[PDB]
Design a binder for this molecule. Structure first.
Ligand SMILES: CN(C)C/C=C/C(=O)Nc1cccc(-c2c(-c3ccccc3)oc3ncnc(N[C@H](CO)c4ccccc4)c23)c1
Length: 311
């Protein structure tokens, strides 16, 4: 009737891993960096570990839903669950992504990110998303904050809270508890709480826009109430400065009204691959190589004394 989900859910002992330091104490719990040392083996695996504070009644069924889907994915551009630990409070264990979320990263390194990294990230995210679509899965929260950085050359999608499965028969998902980030959401999602792989494509467009802007807040001024209307009026996010029309047009197609006329992730991979073979033709970034005499002002007639000889 549907494909059986034969994913393993590993149970891990509290003793076989050491928390080292807190990475993030949000209102969603806290996440530690840690080391997982399975006793059987002779390995040590850098991990991230997530738990929530009291047992919130629903929220403990929420984190186990996240566990369910993180354990059900296996792609190089998607964070997989390593195991759960059933202590007083449940802990999710996953591979450590040392450089944190992409959003922070484009901000903390604006001046040192070239077109090849930007376009290669766009490829990689579309592969991750094309995989989740192959696995009949709808993320419902794609955003630059929810893409983590293993290295600057390798990013993966994460945060599978909110993610939902869809059999062969359904093409859609009707949410109820509407607390989803408004500014990454398709129109159909904001109006009718409909979620499709093509609504993920919209959120992909907004994610790409975040990156090409080195981490700007979309609709930076505007409040969530309005978003529905101005998107309906036909307004969209502006063309980022570094973006050619070629790139910006792909974004805009992710933001069409008719969801079926937006591009498929399998297409976004192709089109961004093509572009990543000649990056500087499609993204113009002042200084696009390396910016390395440490003066900190604006001067184009600076010469070095070693090249200024006896007048
Ligand atoms: C809000 N803005 C700041 C945008 C960016 C937000 C952000 O990066 N938050 C975040 C919060 C907590 C941990 C992490 C986080 C970091 C990290 C590493 C170094 C510095 C900072 C973070 O490394 C991670 N590796 C794997 N999963 C992670 N974290 C998810 C939680 O979803 C997870 C862990 C275990 C199991 C499942 C999932 C993280 C990332």
């Amino acid at each position: 009737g549907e494909a059986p989900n034969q994913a393993l859910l590993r149970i891990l002992k509290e003793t076989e891993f050491k928390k080292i330091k807190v990475l993030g104490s949000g209102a969603f719990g806290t996440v530690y960096k840690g080391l997982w040392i399975p006793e059987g083996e002779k390995v040590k695996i850098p991990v991230a570990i997530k738990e929530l504070r009291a047992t919130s009644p629903k929220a403990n069924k929420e984190i186990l839903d996240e566990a369910y889907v993180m354990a059900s994915v296996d792609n190089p551009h998607v964070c997989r669950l390593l195991g759960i630990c059933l202590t007083s409070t449940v802990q999710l264990i996953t591979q450590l992504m040392p450089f944190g979320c992409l959003l922070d990263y484009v901000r903390e390194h604006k001046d040192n990110i070239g077109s090849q990294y930007l376009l290669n990230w766009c490829v990689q995210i579309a592969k991750g998303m094309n995989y989740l679509e192959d696995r009949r899965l709808v993320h419902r929260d794609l955003a630059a904050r929810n893409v983590l950085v293993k290295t600057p050359q390798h990013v993966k999608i994460t945060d599978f809270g909110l993610a939902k499965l869809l059999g062969a028969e359904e093409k859609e998902y009707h949410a109820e508890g509407g607390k989803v980030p408004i500014k990454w959401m398709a129109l159909e999602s904001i109006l009718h709480r409909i979620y499709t792989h093509q609504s993920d494509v919209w959120s992909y467009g907004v994610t790409v826009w975040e990156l090409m802007t080195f981490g700007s807040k979309p609709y930076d001024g505007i409040p969530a109430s309005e978003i529905s209307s101005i998107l309906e009026k036909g307004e969209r996010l502006p063309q980022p400065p570094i973006c050619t029309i070629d790139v910006y047009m792909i974004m805009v197609k992710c933001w069409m009204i008719d969801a079926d006329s937006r591009p498929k992730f399998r297409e976004l991979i192709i089109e961004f691959s093509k572009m990543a073979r000649d990056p500087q033709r499609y993204l113009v970034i002042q200084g696009d190589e390396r910016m390395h005499l440490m003066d900190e002002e604006d001067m184009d007639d600076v010469v070095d004394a070693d090249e200024y000889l006896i007048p």
